[PDB]
Each structure stands twice: as C-alpha cells, then as structure tokens.
Design an enzyme around this catalytic site. Structure first.
Site: not given
Lengths: 293, 293, 293, 293
Positions: D42-43, D130, D154-155
């Site tokens: 995302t980042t 996740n 990764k949550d």
C-alpha cells in the site's frame, strides 16, 4: 496491573437478586486474587436492573469487600445522581457510568454534560465505562480529556490502540481493557489491567496470565492466554451473558442462579454442548495445577 | 398508506410526564390527519420510561383516541409481559416491542423466544419495532417470519430493500418505514406507510406528501418531501430528540415542556440557530398554503 | 426511467476479451429493451482490465450501439485521462469513473480533484459511478455537488435516501440506483432508473418490472420484482460476479465465456446447484409469458 | 522482533519510477537499522503499479539489499503468477499478496484458491498481506490456516486480538502488525514485529521503540511510541500516503520525488502546515539524540 471482575448478578427463580449466592461468588473471587469488583456492569446485567436493584447489588457485595467500582448510569439522570449520592455511605474505590445507551446520534455536548453532572455530584472517583457496541457511541480519549474528571476508564472497544490513547492523552488516568483475550498483552505493554468477564468463572486463569506476563514470561502467559481465549469463544456459542452462569458453576463448583430474561438461561442440551467444548480445557488446567481437580 | 406519529413524551420541569401537554399534542395530531399514534417509541423516550410511566402515557393518549400502538418492551421481560396484559382493557390497535437493546451478541434463539413470549400473552396484535441502530441488532424479514406472530413491522433501518423484504417474505404483514425522508417513496412503492418522528411538528407536511404521492403527483410530492428533508437535517444539528420539542412549539404553537435528561433541552442559543435554519422553510410552507400563520 | 445494463465482459480460455461473444450479448440486450449499456463496470470486471482492454470493450460494444457509458477510472490518472480523450471520436452517452479504490482515507480534496480533472479533459458528459463498498469511499450528493460537473450518478449504496439526495441537491442530474431490487421502487418514486447487473441475464424481467411500475400496476410490479429478488439472492450463493455468467447462459441461451481469475468460473457442482434454485423461477416466468419456454 | 518498511515508491515528474531515489532511500533505511523491506505494498502504491513496474521496484531495491518481501498481487492472477515465478532468480525473504481488492462478496472458496495458486507456483516463502480496509475483506487466522501455506502474515486490522489469533491458530507462523502505533506493544507481547509505514521517515524512532521494549523499559518505549503517534496523526491530516513523501524529506534530508496521482502531492501550504505540526516533535527527538541536529 489488576484483574477486575465485572461480577455477574445471580437471580432467584422469582427474578430477584439472589444475595446469598452473590456474596458466595464475591468472596471466592476475592480469595482467588481478584483485585476489585465492578458492580452493575454489562456482565452483571446492569441495564436490566432498576435503580433500587443497582443499590441492592452494591450492599450485597459491600458486605464482602470495599474494593468496589459502582456502576450507576442510566437514561434517567435523576436516578443516576441519586445513586452517586447514596454511594457516599460506602467506602469504595469509585463509581462508574457507561454513556447513555440506545439513543443514536446524541450530541457530544450532551454526552459531556451527562458525565460532568455525575462528577459534580460524586463523593468518589468516577470511572468511564466505555462500551461502544452496547451503548452505540464511543467516548474516546479526546472526549474523556474534555470531560476532565475521570480517574480511570475501562475501554471495551476491541482495539488496543484506542485503549492506549487514553493513557497518551491522560497520563494520570488509570486505563483498563475490557477484553479477556488481552490480559497477557495489557500487562506486558504498560496498561493498568483488565475488567474481564471471564474472570467470573476462571479467576485462577486470569490472575495467572497476569502474573506470568508481569514476570516477563511472555511465552507461558500467551499459551495460557490462548487456552483462556478458547473458553471465551465457547462461551459465545450460545450467548456469553447466559453462558457465563453455566461456566461459573462448572469451573467454580457453586451456582449463580438464573440470568434475567430476555437474557435467558441455557437449556440442558446447550449446557451439555457447552461443557463438551470446555471439558478438555478444564483437564489441561487441572494438569497444569491452575485448578484444584 | 398511513402516517403514524411516534409521539413525543412531554416532561415537566421536574421530570414527570406532563399529561396535559401530551393530550393537547395528541389531539392536534389526530385533528391534523395523523392516522395512528405510536406510544413509548424512541421519539417518546420510551427506554427512558419506567413501566409505570409507559402505562401513564398509554392512559393519557387513550383519553384522546383509541388509535394507539403501545410499545412495551424493555430489559425486564416480566415488566413487558405485565404491560402487555394490562393493555387488555384498552381498545387499541396493537402492542409493539423493540428487540432487547444494549446487550451485544444475543443469540437469535433468545431473540425469537423474547418476541414469541410477548405474542403468547398479548391481548392485541403485536408489532415489531425494528430499530437496529438504537438496539444493536436487526430483526430482519426472515427472523420476523420465523417469529411468526407479528401483525406489522415498523422498520427504522435506512435501506428500503430491507423494508420491502418484510412484505416479500410476509405478504400479509403491515410494513412501515421509520424514515421521514421516505414518505413520498413509501406511498409510491406499495408499502403501508411511515412512522415519522417529524410528523410531531409538521403533521400537515407528512400527510400532504402522502396524499400527493397517492394522487401520483410524484414531482409535487418530492418537492415537498425535499423541504421536509431539510427540516429533518436541521433537527439533527443539536440532537433531534431534543430539537423535536423546539420544532413542535415553533411550527404548532404549543410547547411540549422538556425532554428527560440526558436528552437535554436545547439552550437559548441553540434554539435561535435552529429556528434560523427553518425560518425560510416555514414561510415557504405558508406560501404554499400548507401551514397557516 | 431507464434500465441500464452493466455489461459482463466475456473472456476466452486464454484470458482475453471475447469480442464476438460480447457483441452478441450487447445485441440481445438492446433487442430486449435495455436502454443503455454501462461498459467496464464492476459487473464487467473493469478494475481487472488494462486501459487497452477497457478500450477494446468499448470498441466491441460500439459496433452494436451508441447507447454507451464508458467507465474509464483507475489508479493511474494518466490512463484515465487518456481513455477519456480517446472517447472523443465515439458517439456515446457519456464517460464514467468510480472513486479511486483500495486506498483508505484519501482526502476529500484529492477526491474532488481527481473527478474535476476528468471533467476538464472529457469530450462527453461525465457520470459518477458511486460504488462505496467496492472503492472504500462514498461520493455523496454533497461532494457530487461540490465537484459540480456530473451529468448523472449511478448509486450502488443500498439506501435509497442517499440516492434521492442526489436529486434533491442536484435537481438537473440524472440519478440511477445500482440495485436490481429497487427497479419497481425507483420507477415509482421519480428517479431516473436502474443500472442493474441482473439485466445481463433477465433483461425481460427488469424491463417488465419498470413498465408495470410506470403503468401504476405496483402490485404486479412488486410480485415480479420479488421474483427477481430471489434470482439475485441465488446468484450471491457462490459469488454473483461469477454466477452472472451461468445465469446469462441459462436464461438467454448463449454463453459468455469465462470471467477473469481470481473471479473464478463456477465449477460444475456449483453450476448444478445454482440452476436448481432458479428452475422454479424460470418455470413461473415462462408461465407468465415473460420468458419463452 | 523486527521492523519492516513498506517502502515508498518515488515517481518522477513524468510518472515513472525514480529508481535512483528509491535506491538512496532503501540504502538509508538499511543503514538506520531496518530489518527488511516490503516492496509494492500500500505505502508504495502497489495497486497503482503495473506488473512491469512492480518488478522494476524489486530490481532497484535488490541492488541495495536482498532483505526483501516482494508483493505481487492484483486482479489478474496470470500477472501475479508471472511475478511469483520471475522472483525465482532473486534471493529474497519472500513474496506476498493482499486479497483481491475492489470486488465485494467474493467467496471464501475463491479467496482460498487465489492464495493457494500463488503458493503452488511460488519459489519463495509466501506472506499474507492482510489489509481488510483496502481490499474490503479479511483473511483471518482461520482462513489463513485453511489456506495453510503462509510462512507469515502482516495484519493491518487495528485490533491486536485479531493479530494474536494468527499465532494462536498458526504457532509456526511469523506474525506482524501493520500499525506504527503498536511497535512498543508488539515487541512486549511476543509478536514478531511491525511493518510500519512511518519507518520510511523515522526509522530511528521505530527501531528505538522496538529496542526499548525488548529491554523491558516499557515506560520509555511508550513515551517514544506516543511521540511517534503524534507524527502518524499529523501525516493523516492531508492524506498519509502523500504526506509520507513530505515527511521523509523533512526528517531524512533527501526527497522521494512524487506520488502517482490520484495520490496527489501536497501543495506548498499543506507542506507548511504539516511541518508546523511536527516541528516540535523533531526538536524533542533531537534533544533526545534520536535524531541528529
């Protein structure tokens, strides 16, 4: 950090508070290391109790201990004020209130005024009982700071970032989580404890998780935390508020009477299925010498 | 279709039900074409009322009309059963209940049992009061069919698909929307009407939208509906349960006293600003010969 | 009011757009009274398509009809601008974009700027494609008005209050609902129509619901609408986006190839079960002369 | 426990990946103590990247370290399969995928098949990314166990209960939180670390919190955690994904070019106000010798 039990309210067959069974329950909890008892919370069907019954609950538990937080809130402010004032005669830890429940889209200003009105009249420290799912609104760390008179908060939102923010914006505030599943984590991350419904029926486990985490035995704490998690999960199959009665009898050996309908008691098939789900956990806990056989 | 007012409960300065103002309000609504009155709903602060006060409201309104649906629900089932039975001596339309509020994750099995218990003791037809945002759980068209004893439903979920589903799975059920914003739409799509908080302070508008829509003057209906939408939005700025009092006085001429804290009354500045928000709409409504001067 | 099909994208076995199957599908839909075709929507798996593929879809449907809304949006603004500019040489109804998807908590300012950018370069009217579940954010009637350049909106929020608010705040805007379940209601309440995925496989039903409602035969309209509701429900059991391919084959005779993985095609067991649940509905629909035996 | 940076993707003014500024950034992060680099998250605007660009990113970063987790998911499984296979010639920690985004109500069956396919073709360990807010669906501990081939998770759900459940149901699994605000807590409670967007611009802060917590200076960890929290909150005022570029420049000296619209770059006044908000924090981090003058 502390383990605080939001103590169940036992009712008779006549739908009155069973004071005898309640005192027995309270005295077991204190003897097994619970630090304090939160009276008339969600788990104690507080919103189902009249103002007179909230007071009756305080008197029965106060005969046992003065380590009480006394929940007084409701939708008639005059009654909540009267309960705050009547608590003057009791040497307890504090009083508490959830936010006015049911009504959606209440203004922040009216929520603030409600809580400040209770602080104005309170003869004891005032604790925030933050149960956003039950009440329909969150009183987060910023609104808590704005209200400006909470000695502590119990945060039942499942998001420890939210819980940690009370301590960040209010460093002198006592901050507890309402989750049974975060006893290990709360104790290991610098918060003040857990108001744990599951400590009604496995106070031995909740206190031991906490001890292990305090001793920086994070791995043992977590393996016991995970066993506790499975019990919580089993308690939700049929409704946790009703299931908590059955579990306390099963694990602790005395009964807590009935819940108050529409919190209905489990039937005999549900009771059997539920015990089935936790039979093996009990045996592991006896093996581990956490429960007497 | 019908307009049903969930009537406001006026309180005195000392937080008792003001029976005289309630009767004046009820008669005005009936005279202005409201079909039925829904007593002890959200808008009447039902959850804030003791069983005894819920009965007081019934008696006061029943002095005015028998066109009453009597909301009796609460978290003490004995009290709800007692109110249901007491309604036998009143020649009213029906009784109703919301789902047990506050408590999260109640089992469907217990929710069904709660409503079936009321149906079994009820001496009148029973209406489902589905207010999922206020109570925390939905009783949808499928659970309602499984309960099987509802004569009607008032659905306060904002999703007209959900509301049509009651008619689809329960063809003989009366189905109302709780939304003031859907009077035109409900009357156009074959549903049975609206239980509209805003008909407390503008019954003339809510009735007129209905009639325009029935007459199939849909453009005219929506134009009025959209003016009514702006009044609803204005009522929400400071809190609509409180604002409903100010707006009834402003549009209907008579005052309804105070709400019951913590639904606090609007202060003088809030009231100024609220009137400023709806002044224009009033003059528009008089221009259209919907309101008099 | 209109019925607009968010047209399915057929793919070959090696995962390319099947242009010929797409043209047959478009031809059928137009033949059976679909007013316009929404190309590269959710239902057409627009997000799974490259800009080049979005263009191929348009070119194939454009052989059949000029009644096209060309969905161009994505996460690369340069591609969306380019697709918008390329549409200049097509006689189409408009272009459309959903909000930038995936990214949570994007500033409103950035959202407005994305849409105003597309409006600035667009050679056709621009439609807002409001799919808030899918994108993660809502562009409501207020933000739409703020953007100020939308000729229409497709609202896939399940809440017709939200949809009506686009008309109320933007009286000149065309306003469609995205729900197959509100064809009757949209047509009855003065809205401009539905963009209905289920018109892919039952164009005849969706067109007939609309005409009935237009003819003020609301009771017939709802009985047919409720039949359609059940097919929509059946299609969700295994995933509507996949199931939509099976049901077009079943109701309309021709297949639409495969979807694009991870929108996987229904296996043979799932296909059997799905057909089982609409068999009866088909039967009735032939029985009503809406479909051919 | 570890700190893992979901590395920002710098873009040129003409919207291509600036490979040289990426290398500088990756170099700084490794020098300042970051354990691993999560690429195309995302980042890094992973979803805004084509498959070719996703590989561009791998290659550039791989010139700096092999301590890489390579995110490869998207809405075309063929492209994701191809990136997974292509990874075989890089000696990296592993590959990763979020769930298929945008499309709501995808079957658990299809979600499992998506991930299991990636596992069947992967030459490296496969990590679960996740991100339920971004994708619109959760792959929780149960679903992750049913899939059964994840080396790690990764949550990004903000609920550490949900994160702990991965380790409870999958004790061999590496379990990270995606939250910058839970670095102190994750380290204290026996989880494996944090994939922290904020370590792009304050890797010193995130590594220090981690070290303080593993030194059981929880009081100190939290004091620093709470300072970092204020930075995270500052970053969200104008959109965190764009603010992360401005904050990397401010705290670390070099710039990272541009984000990819519609992730728009902050304007001069937005940069102004953002700095004003983190000015004080920069000072105290200097005073503390966490940041050099």
């Amino acid at each position: 950090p502390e383990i605080i039990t939001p103590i169940i309210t036992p009712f008779t067959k006549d739908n009155r508070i069973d004071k005898e069974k309640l005192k027995i329950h309270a005295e077991n909890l204190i003897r097994k290391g619970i630090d304090k008892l939160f009276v008339n919370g969600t788990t104690g069907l507080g919103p189902s109790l009249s103002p007179e019954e909230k007071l009756e609950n305080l008197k029965a538990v106060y005969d046992v201990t003065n380590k009480i937080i006394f929940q007084v809130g409701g939708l008639n402010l005059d009654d909540a004020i009267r309960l705050a004032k009547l608590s003057k005669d009791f040497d307890i830890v504090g009083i508490a209130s959830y936010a006015p429940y049911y009504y959606p889209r209440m203004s922040e200003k009216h929520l603030v005024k409600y809580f400040k009105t209770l602080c104005e009249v309170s003869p004891h420290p005032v604790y925030l009982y933050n149960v956003p799912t039950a009440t329909g609104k969150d009183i987060d760390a910023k609104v808590a700071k704005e209200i400006g008179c909470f000695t502590g908060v119990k945060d039942c939102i499942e998001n420890i970032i939210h819980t940690l923010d009370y301590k960040r914006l209010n460093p002198n505030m006592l901050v507890y989580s309402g989750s049974d599943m975060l006893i290990a984590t709360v104790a290991s991350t610098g918060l003040d404890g857990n108001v744990a419904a599951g400590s009604n029926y496995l106070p031995e486990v909740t206190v031991t998780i906490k001890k292990l985490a305090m001793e920086r035995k994070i791995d043992e704490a977590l393996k016991l935390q995970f066993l506790h998690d499975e019990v919580i999960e089993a308690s939700r199959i049929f409704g946790s508020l009703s299931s908590n009665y059955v579990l306390t009898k099963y694990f602790q050996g005395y009964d807590l009477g009935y819940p108050r309908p529409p919190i209905f008691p489990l039937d005999d098939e549900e009771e059997r299925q539920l015990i089935k789900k936790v039979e093996g956990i009990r045996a592991k806990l006896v093996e581990l010498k956490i429960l007497k056989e």
